[PDB]
RNA sequence: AUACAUUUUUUGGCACGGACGGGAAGAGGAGACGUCGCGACCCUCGGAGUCGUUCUUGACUUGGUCGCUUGAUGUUUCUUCUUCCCGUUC
């Protein structure tokens, strides 16, 4: 109903912690009311990139800790 | 701002290889092309490929995958 | 002297302080033994009607009397109904009645108090008949009847008790059967009104402020 | 139509409750929420081979409750009537 | 029995809970009665 | 409306704590909270379920993965209750 | 343009296979709904692709479904 | 004044600066508090011995000051100003305990009272409000 | 504890609270909620490692109703 | 409520309160308040419910050795 | 009919009630499971008179002729 | 006495004389990652405060480290027996 206020986090590189003790990095592009995250893709936590931009389901998200301050 | 509702719509008209991961299931991944779009995240993804995760390839057909088990979408 | 004596610790609500005895909880166990679900609650009380006659529980049992699950249930079924008998009638000497049943168990039941005119004399440990008393006395030291009396001594002694205690509680047993035949033919409003009154008899004091 | 209303009319019944993690819960349903939050009184907790803990008042959540063991003598058809 | 009297006077009827309470209360009275009697035989 | 939702709204400014379903406790200044407990924190410490700590700047946390949130005792007094 | 829900209604009275959250299935689909609740006839239970038993007429709850396959 | 169920329930039950019950010839009927209090207070009474408690897991502090405790039959035990005379009457504390106070006792003026207590009762960390050292 | 009919009526009572991961919370109910979210006055996080009850004193806690298994009443008011 | 000072200021704040709670217990119920800040080290205020319970607590325990040091009490 | 469950309970019972949630009242209840130690093979099972059921635990309802 | 199950809640990704315990010696429990405790030849030396307005209320601000000469406690991988002393149960 209320939007997740990620307008601070816009166009910044964020470590998006997902299910299964995995982590996703990448710079933010957009979001919706279900907290699904569209972002330009980065590497998966030795380290490796798959894809140009990735779209994350909201249910997978443990947290999203920003790399830039 | 590119929303995730609109972002899947562009993937359907692009017909490019997508790699989908599975929710609370690390070792198995799905690689195919997005065909469907629903009000939820549920899609049909034809000519997909199951991939065992490096800690190769397996045969697999055309599949709709239930959106609750989606983790990543990238295309 | 009797400050902390609480009848709610000794009696339950489904007994109504000795008015009934709860046997629904044993029908739950009884279904586990029968390997079907065709037993209703009235049919189980009809099965318990075998334990009122001196012959019916022993000559036409619900099962084979050497089933393990059947023998396991009946020990518990003896034990609760035995403890219910001494619970509802606390003024009676417990050891006097217990020694009385044991005296009737040793002198009459183990000597063949069940005697029939066509097959002869029945033996509970043996589950077999005997022609005459001379051939009946000659099996009591035989090797087959040594084994059954050394393995099934506790179960038969419990089975003889559950017979004799339920004959002592015949008016209680007929009253519980009337409860189920009433409660089954209740409605929703009739059953909800009944479950209130049974609870109010449980959790209200034995002496009111309005008694003479 | 609803089994929620089937749970609301089942009152004061000494029942057994089985949880998602297997805990067998002997209790008496005083009232049941529309979201299956069962309110019990005179509760007895027993594990699926391990020891018993008796307690007075325990309010269990609905998704935990896998199975409510219904009582022994009960007409189901009259309860299904609206 | 039915008129609930002993010699002449009819008492007021009691419910089952108050009777059975006193039946276990007289029970611990009789246990006290026999316990004292045993020691009294073992001193006298 | 949810009343524990509203006290978490009052928890803005103060030093709150936050453990996840993974068992990762946090501690930092609560910035913004919503209906669903989508809480943001600053200057936050982060304990690992093994025991290890990691300092990190600015976290966003989705409410579905919350086990509990510890609020300071000064909000007990006023104004919600 | 092939959306997920007309494809699901199109795949009625046809062979399908269902993996769980884990045991794979095989059967002919009977009817479905919006919630992706399933009904199948002539069920065959593949335990990791090994046919355990022929169940026949079954009914799959929607929350456990992971994919549908031909 | 005997211990009874009428006594304990009207006695004050407030948290002390842990949950505390505020309370006598001899102590008894401690089931009636249903093990709900960690710290207890039996001070300013006439208790002759600490005898006859029930099984009480939650009870961790017995404040038994100003009594006539002359014998014994749990993290903190305050037995200040009682009637202990012999160190062998402290031998029943061997089965028990990190805080012990036996000041105000005639036993305290015995020779080698500090060494006899600390050896036979090693679990004590604080004895007469002084920390037990290695030397 | 008295014989209460709902939970909201028994406010400000001392509650034992179980959760899914195995943790045991004792604390006074300040507030209920529609999804069983609970605000706890002096909430103590009690855990048993795979031996003995371990203790952690938290304070004023907002507890998510998703994780809560059941609520047991521990003690009186005050 | 009696103001006591000249205490051994090394004894820990969780520990120092627990020893004062037992020692003043004989006089009456105890509620002890103290801190470890530089103004307040070695210092404590034990708050008694009864007034004469504080008065018996101050005079009898005047200069009693506590944690190695004889403490000084005031009103 | 026979019903599989999340924690491996083959539930053989009679259907009485049914709704949106697949919440079910069960008569003639038969669960089939295995409580085992490591390296233990035992099939243990019981009967229950009447039993209410939650729908999320249900995986597959199957019907035997 | 006078209202409804497809991502943030509830339809979940859930499941798989004989014993005990503690302490010490010896023969074939250990390595680290963090937490706080006992001693110190070390450092360090002394709900609350204030105002605006009114006869009672509103706003702004707030032990460090070294040894353990056997201090307690959680993750994470690998591979016990004999004797003596203390206590519980039969
Ligand atoms: Zn014979």
Swiss-Prot record, chain A:
Predominant cellular place of this UniProt entry's protein: nucleus
Gene Ontology cellular-component terms listed: catalytic step 2 spliceosome; commitment complex; cytoplasm; nucleus; precatalytic spliceosome; SMN-Sm protein complex; spliceosomal complex; spliceosomal tri-snRNP complex
Disulfide cysteine pairs (residue numbers): none
One MF annotation (Gene Ontology) recorded for this entry: RNA binding
GO biological process entries: 7-methylguanosine cap hypermethylation; mRNA 5'-splice site recognition; mRNA splicing, via spliceosome; spliceosomal complex assembly; spliceosomal snRNP assembly; U2-type prespliceosome assembly
UniProt domain Sm: residue ranges: 1-69
Secretion signal, residue range per the UniProt entry: none
Transmembrane segments: none
Entry superkingdom: Eukaryota
Protein localization: Nucleus; Cytoplasm
Keywords assigned by UniProt, alphabetized: Cytoplasm, mRNA processing, mRNA splicing, Nucleus, Ribonucleoprotein, RNA-binding, Spliceosome
InterPro entries in alphabetical order: Lsm7/SmG-like (IPR044641), LSM_dom_sf (IPR010920), Sm (IPR047575), Sm_dom_euk/arc (IPR001163), Sm_G (IPR034098)
One Pfam entry name: LSM
Record text on subunit structure and interactions: Component of the Sm core complex, present in spliceosomal snRNP U1, U2, U4/U6 and U5. The core complex contains SMB1, SMD1, SMD2, SMD3, SME1, SMX3 and SMX2 (Sm proteins B, D1, D2, D3, E, F and G, respectively), and is probably a heptameric ring structure. SMX2 specifically interacts with SME1.
Its biological purpose: Plays a role in pre-mRNA splicing as a core component of the spliceosomal U1, U2, U4 and U5 small nuclear ribonucleoproteins (snRNPs), the building blocks of the spliceosome.
Miscellaneous comment text of the record: Present with 1400 molecules/cell in log phase SD medium.
Protein family membership: Belongs to the snRNP Sm proteins family.
Name of this protein: Small nuclear ribonucleoprotein G
Biological source species: Saccharomyces cerevisiae (strain ATCC 204508 / S288c)
